[PDB]
């Protein structure tokens, strides 16, 4: 049996809901280690240790832009840290450095008896997410740390689109009408460069650059896919294989591609 499986058997309805099965609490990191600020979201009743995910905003952006992922993922059985960068104008490499520093601090807090997440984290199972340059930073983190279990960047931007070294299962959320990091010059070339991993490309119909941010009109689909990807690859949970690998057959998806998934 799978020692990392948490929660009940998933359904489309349970994955599309605003909240998963677990109760969520949060705290602000009092002394951020290698990044600007952080909020940690965690389940109080997951029934076992869970993996950790670090999420980074875009250029000029703060935690508010990606906050919705905190409760959404944590409620399904993950410890999630959303960060502010040292500067809102940090570039993708620095964002990657800060994302990994946030993962390191979540691991440190797992061994700190005063922390609300004491003993709640499996520090060997980690994932990376982020918006725009923070999405580029997530891909850099995956390329440099192949022990990461999953990556799910959104509307990514990066100096180069060559991520051919990435072996980490990667889901790329793209926004059809992105005018900041256009799909044909950023997200899709990034996707096409990856030849050694489980990968997926999910483009949201009519979406602006912020199409997967807090307040988006597609939280049912985007949240379902993000949670399913993290569940399948961070937890090795084959109960999520279809949700993770399937073409959603959704009227909200204008482009779908997947490879080496199922």
Swiss-Prot record:
InterPro entries: AB_hydrolase_fold, FrsA_esterase, PET_hydrolase/cutinase-like. The keyword rRNA-binding does not apply. One of its GO terms (cellular component) is extracellular region. One of its GO terms (biological process) is xenobiotic catabolic process. Salts and glycerol enhance the enzymatic activity in vitro towards pNP-esters, while detergents and organic solvents reduce the enzymatic activity. Pfam families: PETase. One of its GO terms (molecular function) is acetylesterase activity. Changing residue 178 to A: Loss of enzymatic activity on PET bottle and on BHET. Its EC number is 3.1.1.101. Optimum temperature is 40 degrees Celsius for PET film hydrolysis. Optimum temperature is 30 degrees Celsius for PET (commercial drinking bottle) hydrolysis and BHET hydrolysis. Optimum temperature is 35-45 degrees Celsius for the hydrolysis of pNP-esters. Remains active even at 65 degrees Celsius (about 60% of maximum activity). Pathway: Xenobiotic degradation. It comes from the Bacteria. It is found in: Secreted. Optimum pH is 9 for PET film hydrolysis. Optimum pH is 9 for PET (commercial drinking bottle) hydrolysis. Optimum pH is 6.5-8.0 for BHET hydrolysis. Optimum pH is 8.0 for the hydrolysis of pNP-esters. The enzyme is active at pH 6-10, has an optimal pH range of 7-9 and it is rapidly inactivated below pH 7.0 or above pH 9.0. It catalyses: (ethylene terephthalate)(n) + H2O = (ethylene terephthalate)(n-1) + 4-[(2-hydroxyethoxy)carbonyl]benzoate + H(+); (2,5-ethylene furandicarboxylate)(n) + 2 H2O = (2,5-ethylene furandicarboxylate)(n-1) + 2,5-dicarboxyfuran + ethylene glycol + 2 H(+); an acetyl ester + H2O = an aliphatic alcohol + acetate + H(+); a butanoate ester + H2O = an aliphatic alcohol + butanoate + H(+). Changing residue 93 to E: Displays increased thermostability and increased PET degradation activity by 14-fold at 40 degrees Celsius. Poly(ethylene terephthalate) binds at residues 59, 133, 157. Belongs to the AB hydrolase superfamily. Monomer. PETase retains the ancestral alpha/beta-hydrolase fold but exhibits a more open active-site cleft than homologous cutinases. This is Poly(ethylene terephthalate) hydrolase.
